[PDB]
Write a protein that binds this ligand. Sequence first.
Ligand SMILES: CCCCCCCC/C=C/CCCCCCCC(=O)OC[C@H](COP(=O)(O)OCC[N+](C)(C)C)OC(=O)CCCCCCC/C=C/CCCCCCCC
Lengths: 52, 151, 97
Amino acid sequence: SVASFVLLSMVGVAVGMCMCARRRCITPYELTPGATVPFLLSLICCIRTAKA
Amino acid sequence: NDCIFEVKHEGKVTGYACLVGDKVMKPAHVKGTIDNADLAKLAFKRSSKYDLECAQIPVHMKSDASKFTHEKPEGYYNWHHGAVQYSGGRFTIPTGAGKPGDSGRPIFDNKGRVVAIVLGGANEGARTALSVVTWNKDIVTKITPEGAEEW
Amino acid sequence: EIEVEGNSQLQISFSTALASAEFRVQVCSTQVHCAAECHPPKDHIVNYPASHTTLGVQDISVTAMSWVQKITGGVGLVVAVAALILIVVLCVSFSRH
Ligand SMILES: CCCCCCCC/C=C/CCCCCCCC(=O)OC[C@H](COP(=O)(O)OCC[N+](C)(C)C)OC(=O)CCCCCCC/C=C/CCCCCCCC
């Protein structure tokens, strides 16, 4: 039980830290008016539904 | 007035949100719900690093917005209260022209396009340096002088 | 103690509570490594106390515990790549302005 709980918490933390990576690396392009991310970064980050 | 909307908390106006291009620019440190009810419905991807909240404008009804530009050759620029001078890297105003509540007002060039949006200021003598949110190509760069309060 | 001389082999008997045998036999100042897979007994209960020492402590599981190492290494690897990505993003964002 302890091993499963810790492993699930660790994978969840990995996902969350991945999520925090998207927010901090995509807001500078999202905040700029009339901006467009480069092609390479568009591939890497999964957040592409909103073309902001 | 044109394309800037006042933002108020209760009856007290705190700041103004500009419609630059395709974004509803607005500075984070102001508190308000915007005068327009429809704009309040939008979801803002706010960031504490740049003190900004922005969202996609409803281009279906508000496609009319201020033009923007990225280059800032040193010289003179105009906003609501007086005119401002790009002092080789700093936005400077006469001390009177700055006052809390002006946060969120844009600034234009000679050609009439926004180049920044003001947040606060600090004064060394008669002139007051400005804390603005300018932008280069596809990226914004917050600029802040020493000891600048938030308007 | 046993009697040894020549170029032959001997035989011993031991009692363990481990599922996988892993132990060193001190044979007249020269150690040796022995390893085998132990199997469960057939009789539920007996009339004498256990000859071996005690219950294996939680440290000593059975080989083919390598599953534990595999899964913990996978999770640690995922966490490591997540941390590296986060820290490189934090450094590049620190480089801004
Ligand atoms: C795909 C999935 C496949 C994966 C397979 C899943 C594997 C599942 C299984 C694992 C096996 C678990 C079963 C082990 C049970 C053995 C029994 C046991 O374990 O009991 C041993 C003794 C007897 O019990 P007692 O009540 O008489 O003792 C306590 C006395 N009382 C109560 C007064 C405190 O208890 C003790 O003495 C224990 C004393 C405390 C010992 C601390 C342990 C030391 C390590 C700590 C962590 C540090 C990390 C180390 C990593 C280093 C690597 C570099």
